[PDB]
Design a protein around this motif. Structure first.
Motif, PDB file in Angstrom:
ATOM      1  N   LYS A   1      32.287  -6.684 -38.582  1.00  0.00           N
ATOM      2  CA  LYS A   1      32.003  -6.149 -39.899  1.00  0.00           C
ATOM      3  C   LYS A   1      30.640  -5.466 -39.825  1.00  0.00           C
ATOM      4  O   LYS A   1      30.436  -4.420 -40.424  1.00  0.00           O
ATOM      5  N   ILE A   2      29.722  -6.051 -39.059  1.00  0.00           N
ATOM      6  CA  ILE A   2      28.379  -5.498 -38.866  1.00  0.00           C
ATOM      7  C   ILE A   2      28.286  -4.440 -37.742  1.00  0.00           C
ATOM      8  O   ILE A   2      27.538  -3.464 -37.843  1.00  0.00           O
ATOM      9  N   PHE A   3      29.051  -4.630 -36.673  1.00  0.00           N
ATOM     10  CA  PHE A   3      28.985  -3.741 -35.528  1.00  0.00           C
ATOM     11  C   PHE A   3      30.396  -3.548 -35.023  1.00  0.00           C
ATOM     12  O   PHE A   3      30.865  -4.308 -34.192  1.00  0.00           O
ATOM     13  N   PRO A   4      31.098  -2.531 -35.535  1.00  0.00           N
ATOM     14  CA  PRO A   4      32.485  -2.367 -35.093  1.00  0.00           C
ATOM     15  C   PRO A   4      32.475  -1.774 -33.686  1.00  0.00           C
ATOM     16  O   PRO A   4      32.330  -0.568 -33.542  1.00  0.00           O
TER      17      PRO A   4
ATOM     18  N   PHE B   1      33.692   1.904 -31.152  1.00  0.00           N
ATOM     19  CA  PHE B   1      33.056   3.200 -30.889  1.00  0.00           C
ATOM     20  C   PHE B   1      32.295   3.209 -29.565  1.00  0.00           C
ATOM     21  O   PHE B   1      32.163   4.253 -28.910  1.00  0.00           O
TER      22      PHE B   1
ATOM     23  N   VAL C   1      31.400   6.005 -26.020  1.00  0.00           N
ATOM     24  CA  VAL C   1      30.025   6.154 -25.580  1.00  0.00           C
ATOM     25  C   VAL C   1      29.901   5.718 -24.109  1.00  0.00           C
ATOM     26  O   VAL C   1      29.298   6.407 -23.284  1.00  0.00           O
TER      27      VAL C   1
ATOM     28  N   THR D   1      19.858  -2.055 -35.541  1.00  0.00           N
ATOM     29  CA  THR D   1      21.199  -2.022 -36.112  1.00  0.00           C
ATOM     30  C   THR D   1      21.670  -3.383 -36.679  1.00  0.00           C
ATOM     31  O   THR D   1      22.110  -3.466 -37.831  1.00  0.00           O
TER      32      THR D   1
ATOM     33  N   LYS E   1      19.993  -6.495 -36.949  1.00  0.00           N
ATOM     34  CA  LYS E   1      19.053  -7.362 -37.647  1.00  0.00           C
ATOM     35  C   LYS E   1      19.282  -8.816 -37.247  1.00  0.00           C
ATOM     36  O   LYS E   1      19.342  -9.138 -36.066  1.00  0.00           O
TER      37      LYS E   1
ATOM     38  N   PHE F   1      34.265   8.777 -32.259  1.00  0.00           N
ATOM     39  CA  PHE F   1      33.304   7.671 -32.166  1.00  0.00           C
ATOM     40  C   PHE F   1      32.079   7.899 -33.048  1.00  0.00           C
ATOM     41  O   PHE F   1      31.454   6.945 -33.535  1.00  0.00           O
TER      42      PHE F   1
ATOM     43  N   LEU G   1      27.171   3.485 -39.596  1.00  0.00           N
ATOM     44  CA  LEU G   1      26.089   2.516 -39.358  1.00  0.00           C
ATOM     45  C   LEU G   1      24.773   3.055 -39.901  1.00  0.00           C
ATOM     46  O   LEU G   1      23.966   2.327 -40.462  1.00  0.00           O
TER      47      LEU G   1
END
Ligand SMILES: O=C(O)CCC(=O)C(=O)O
Ligand SMILES: O=C(O)CCC(=O)C(=O)O
Ligand SMILES: [Cl-]
Ligand SMILES: [Cl-]
Ligand SMILES: [Fe+3]
Ligand SMILES: [Fe+3]
Lengths: 318, 318
Positions: free
Chosen positions: A154-157, A160, A164, A204, A206, B160, B167
């Motif tokens: 939910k915080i860092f999907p 993606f 990268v 990002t 925290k 991406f 974010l």
């Protein structure tokens, strides 16, 4: 299990992409894992390059043991198969046991840095399912830590991050003698991957990460988009802390020939420059898939690989 | 059209996510667009904040005209509808005309920086389809340029970038009086989005971008994952260069209430701090969708929005 708890587990995984499962294995199962991995580990000689490559050549890995597939699928089903039902329920997926890893850290080491399982699930399609069971073999306490931190999707999907990482791998593979030392080229390349430093992750995320204590028997279950890392182990409790990790895919999970090719080429390039000889445990999953791919594939699905198809029953719920 | 050409177009879009379509509009259609947009433009007073917000608050936008939805869907179908068949064929999708924009650049300006259509297609789900037709209203030559550069999705799969942007938006919205000037807070925040500078893009893409000359009547068709930017216009040919842009979605494209909320909150926050009054052309698509959402949605699909559903025939192929 409790039923009420099982529903909280399902609930939590749906929100976060992970859940700590307390007391899922019995002490006897743990002791068996310990002994068996201790034996398997004594027998083979393993290097840091395959974990380094798996996380993109960055060389910030500070772990003691980084061994892949020390044991086979049958030894794994022997303690995992009876649990697939709970995991299938939690994820609403049909899980197949695939590959495994053993990681360990000594006191005052960083272990693995923040990552998503793009290295672990490299030979599979990004959007297809992947998850892990992390079984600590030495107690994780509030006072000595040495466990893991992990971030809700939910915080860092994390999905993606795979592109990268693939962009970065593609750059790795454009290296040239002219460039200079391969490892330094990779670490200093101005790729998006390299821009995402720990400070950036920290900014990002925290404090949104979670760190939990684990007694023997507890495990951490998480899908392959969850951002996670090792925590340093403070001295005075364990000489070394081990964790055994099982990687699971879905019945419908597909091979990604393209990333597999990128990894091979990069691996090839690295071994050629550094004059190293990569060793893979016989019946390593990666090797098995590379051959099937090199022969040419009839089907996109992992299940339809010949070794897998033959051993499918042991890999899945009863 | 030629048939042989139409197949090359389809082929090229499948590889790159884009294709230049030469001589798709007739000079008479262009002149009509010019006059009509010239009239619409004289009437309303428009600011730089809505394009700035759309690209994440970065304030590196150097364009003269940044106007959204100056004209309505009916004026657009009147020259676009007869072309939807070719575009549906090229993309293997059923396209609906949705929203539009007019951009212009003066000589020696950078126009828009590198971007993917996360701003343009903000109120729709990332994985759902979106594409654009870019119709230059002033000739783009090898000598004066002032057009666009664009990168194959084979080289830069832009999907991406949407998470990375989300974010960043989420961070925007955590701003505080304590923080200081909102715009500076946003521009200096250590977000992954901010790490992806032009140098990084340049290093990622290399020379893999394409820049093409355009005569009046030519257009550029590209999906919303294509990385693209404005090129500077050299003086001596045009005082100003305009381009009219039509945004298309698929019949099955869905609203993304969550990003829509992020944008609104950020917009709200920015207007409150800077004491600005955002103006939206009546029948702006964004406004229409925000209301439907604010009332509560019966369906996830854009097609099932009441204004859309009513005007659907004009939005689609004959
Ligand atoms: O055991 C550790 O410290 C790290 C394990 C890990 O990253 C994994 O199991 O995916
Ligand atoms: O016209 C320009 O210079 C930029 C247009 C653009 O970014 C778009 O149409 O999406
Ligand atoms: Cl992992
Ligand atoms: Cl765009
Ligand atoms: Fe990991
Ligand atoms: Fe654009």
């Amino acid at each position: 299990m409790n039923r009420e708890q099982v529903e909280q587990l399902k609930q939590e995984y749906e929100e976060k992409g992970y859940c700590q499962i307390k007391k899922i294995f019995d002490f006897s199962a743990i002791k068996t894992i310990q002994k068996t991995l201790d034996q398997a580990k004594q027998e083979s000689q393993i290097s840091k390059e395959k974990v380094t490559l798996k996380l993109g050549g960055i060389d910030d890995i500070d772990t003691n043991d980084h061994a892949y597939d020390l044991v086979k699928y049958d030894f794994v089903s022997s303690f995992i198969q009876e649990k697939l039902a709970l995991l299938n329920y939690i994820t609403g997926k049909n899980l197949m046991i695939m590959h495994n890893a053993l990681f360990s850290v000594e006191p005052n080491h960083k272990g693995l840095p923040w990552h998503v399982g793009v290295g672990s699930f490299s030979f599979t399609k990004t959007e297809d399912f992947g998850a892990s069971i992390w079984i600590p073999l030495d107690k994780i306490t509030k006072e000595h830590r040495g466990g893991m931190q992990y971030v809700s999707t939910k915080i860092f999907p994390g999905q993606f991050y795979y592109s990268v990482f693939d962009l970065h791998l593609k750059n790795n593979i454009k290296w040239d003698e002219s460039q200079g030392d391969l490892n330094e080229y990779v670490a200093n390349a101005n790729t998006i991957y390299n821009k995402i430093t720990e400070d950036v992750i920290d900014y990002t995320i925290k404090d949104g990460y979670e760190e939990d204590e684990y007694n023997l028997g507890d495990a951490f279950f998480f899908n392959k988009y969850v951002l996670h890392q090792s925590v340093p182990l403070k001295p005075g409790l364990h000489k070394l802390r081990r964790a055994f990790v099982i990687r699971l895919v879905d019945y419908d999970t597909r091979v990604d020939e393209e990333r597999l090719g990128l990894f091979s080429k990069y691996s090839q390039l690295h071994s050629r420059y550094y004059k190293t000889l990569p060793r893979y445990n016989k019946d390593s999953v990666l090797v098995m898939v590379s051959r099937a791919v090199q022969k040419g594939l009839k089907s996109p699905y992992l299940r339809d690989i010949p070794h897998v198809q033959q051993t499918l029953a042991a890999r899945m719920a009863a």
